Design an enzyme around this catalytic site. Structure first.
Site, mmCIF file in Angstrom:
data_model
loop_
_atom_site.group_PDB
_atom_site.id
_atom_site.type_symbol
_atom_site.label_atom_id
_atom_site.label_comp_id
_atom_site.label_asym_id
_atom_site.label_seq_id
_atom_site.Cartn_x
_atom_site.Cartn_y
_atom_site.Cartn_z
ATOM 1 N N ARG A 96 -2.721 13.565 7.895
ATOM 2 C CA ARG A 96 -2.024 12.425 7.299
ATOM 3 C C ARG A 96 -1.876 11.296 8.286
ATOM 4 O O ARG A 96 -1.669 10.147 7.869
ATOM 5 C CB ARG A 96 -0.645 12.844 6.830
ATOM 6 N N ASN A 97 -1.961 11.635 9.575
ATOM 7 C CA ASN A 97 -1.869 10.657 10.632
ATOM 8 C C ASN A 97 -3.172 10.306 11.264
ATOM 9 O O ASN A 97 -3.188 9.877 12.408
ATOM 10 C CB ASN A 97 -0.956 11.141 11.712
ATOM 11 N N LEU A 157 0.839 -1.181 0.000
ATOM 12 C CA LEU A 157 0.000 0.000 0.000
ATOM 13 C C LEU A 157 0.874 1.231 0.000
ATOM 14 O O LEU A 157 0.526 2.251 -0.582
ATOM 15 C CB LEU A 157 -0.880 0.031 1.254
ATOM 16 N N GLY A 158 2.009 1.139 0.672
ATOM 17 C CA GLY A 158 2.807 2.307 0.891
ATOM 18 C C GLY A 158 4.244 1.943 1.087
ATOM 19 O O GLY A 158 4.741 1.921 2.213
ATOM 20 N N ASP A 212 2.730 14.451 16.710
ATOM 21 C CA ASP A 212 2.601 14.470 15.254
ATOM 22 C C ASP A 212 1.153 14.316 14.738
ATOM 23 O O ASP A 212 0.875 13.491 13.851
ATOM 24 C CB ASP A 212 3.522 13.429 14.611
ATOM 25 N N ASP A 269 0.034 6.774 13.923
ATOM 26 C CA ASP A 269 1.428 7.185 13.879
ATOM 27 C C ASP A 269 1.904 7.778 15.191
ATOM 28 O O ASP A 269 1.747 8.969 15.429
ATOM 29 C CB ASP A 269 1.683 8.148 12.732
ATOM 30 N N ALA A 320 9.194 6.467 1.184
ATOM 31 C CA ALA A 320 9.426 7.255 2.401
ATOM 32 C C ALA A 320 10.400 6.526 3.345
ATOM 33 O O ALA A 320 11.614 6.792 3.317
ATOM 34 C CB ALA A 320 8.083 7.627 3.120
#
Ligand code: IRE
Length: 300
Positions: free
Chosen positions: A145-146, A22-23, A141, A159, A26
Site C-alpha cells: 500500500r506504500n 484522489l484520496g 511501514d 509514506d 482516513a
C-alpha cells in the site's frame, strides 16, 4: 554523522492548480493537480497531501516529519518531496504516481500482470529499500500500500510518516517479531516487511493472515507459522520470503542480496513464477505540450 543539506522548497499556492481529489478520508485528502514553477514554463503532474483541514498542532508535526524525510532522500525507487506549501494547513507536494498504489494495482489487474513485472517490482523495492539503508533510514511501514506505480514498469516506495534513523528512538501483519514484542526495529525488521510485501504481490493482493486478529499474531509467529506459499510461487521464491521471516534477524537477507537474487530470477521469470497464460500479457487533457515529469525536473 554527516550533515543533511537537502533543500526544502517552499511553494506558493498560486504556483499550482489542483484538479481533483484522489484520496480523502482516513487522515487527509490526497489531491492531484499541476505545478507550474513560475518563471520556468513547465507543468508538473503532482499529488498534494493537505491532510484533514483541522490544523491541530499534533499533525503538523507528523507531516513535517514526513516532508523532512522525503526532502532528504533522492533515488529512483523512492518518492521524493518536490516542496511544501504553508497556506493554513501544510500541503505536501510530490511527483504524481498516476497509476496509484501497487496494492490496488495488483488487485485490479490480476489477469494481466506477468512474472516479469512481478519480479521486476521486487527488484525495484529491494533497490529502494537498499537506498534507504545506505542513508540509514529504517522505513518502519513497508507494504504494498506504500509502494506507488509511476508506470507499470516503474514502482517507487513512499509514506515515511514512520521512517526513522537506525539507532534512534501500528501495522501488525507486516511487522517483524522483535518489533511486535520489543519494539526493536532494524533494516532487518524492514526486510521482514519486505517479505510480507512480496507475499502481497505474489498473491495478487491478498491480505496477510486474513482472518486472524492482530492480538494473536505474536503467538502464531512464535509458534513458527508463516504465510503460505502463494500458488504462482516456485519454491525458490517462497524460500526467499521465508528467509525474510527468520527469527534471527541477522539471518535474514540483506536488501543488496535481495536486489541480486530477484534480479537473477528476473532474467528468466517464467522459471520462477508460474502464471496462467504468461507469454501473452501486456500492461491527460486540454493543453499539455509543456508537461514534464518530476523525474525530469531537476534543480541545482
Ligand atoms: C492516482 O492515485 C494516487 C497517486 C499518487 N501519486 C503520488 N502520490 C500519492 N500519494 C502520496 C503518498 C504520500 C505522500 F506523502 C504524498 Cl505527498 C502523496 C498518490 C496517491 C494516489 O492514490 C492514493 C489511494 C486512493 N484511495 C482511494 C479511496 O480513498 C482513499 C485513497
Amino acid at each position: 554523522e554527516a550533515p543533511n543539506q537537502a533543500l526544502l522548497r517552499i511553494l506558493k499556492e498560486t504556483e499550482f492548480k489542483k484538479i481533483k481529489v484522489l484520496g480523502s478520508g482516513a487522515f487527509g485528502t490526497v489531491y492531484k493537480g499541476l505545478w507550474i514553477p513560475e518563471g520556468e514554463k513547465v507543468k508538473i503532474p503532482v499529488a498534494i497531501k493537505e491532510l484533514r483541514e483541522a490544523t491541530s498542532p499534533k499533525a503538523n508535526k507528523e507531516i513535517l516529519d514526513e516532508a523532512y524525510v522525503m526532502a532528504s532522500v533522492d533515488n529512483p525507487h523512492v518518492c521524493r518531496l518536490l516542496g511544501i506549501c504553508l497556506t493554513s494547513t501544510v500541503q505536501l507536494i510530490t511527483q504524481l504516481m498516476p497509476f496509484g498504489c501497487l496494492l490496488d494495482y495488483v488487485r485490479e489487474h490480476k489477469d494481466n500482470i506477468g512474472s516479469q513485472y512481478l519480479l521486476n517490482w521486487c527488484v525495484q523495492i529491494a533497490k529502494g529499500m537498499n537506498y534507504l539503508e545506505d542513508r540509514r533510514l529504517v522505513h518502519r511501514d513497508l507494504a504494498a500500500r506504500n509502494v506507488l506505480v509511476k508506470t507499470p514498469q516503474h514502482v517507487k516506495i513512499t509514506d515515511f510518516g514512520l521512517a526513522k534513523l537506525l539507532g534512534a528512538e501500528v501495522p501488525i501483519k507486516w511487522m517483524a517479531l522483535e518489533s511486535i514484542l520489543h519494539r526493536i526495529y532494524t533494516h532487518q525488521s524492514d526486510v521482514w516487511s519486505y517479505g510480507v510485501t512480496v507475499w502481497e504481490l505474489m498473491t495478487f493482493g491478498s491480505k496477510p493472515y486474513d482472518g486472524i486478529p492482530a492480538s494473536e499474531i505474536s503467538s502464531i509467529l512464535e509458534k513458527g507459522e508463516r504465510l503460505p506459499q502463494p500458488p504462482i510461487c516456485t519454491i525458490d521464491v517462497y524460500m526467499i520470503m521465508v528467509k525474510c521471516w527468520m527469527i534471527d534477524a541477522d539471518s535474514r537477507p540483506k536488501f543488496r542480496e535481495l536486489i541480486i537474487e530477484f534480479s537473477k530470477m528476473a532474467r528468466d521469470p517464467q522459471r520462477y513464477l508460474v502464471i496462467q497464460g504468461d507469454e501473452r500479457m501486456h500492461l491527460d487533457e486540454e493543453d499539455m505540450d509543456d508537461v514534464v515529469d518530476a523525474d525530469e525536473y531537476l534543480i541545482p
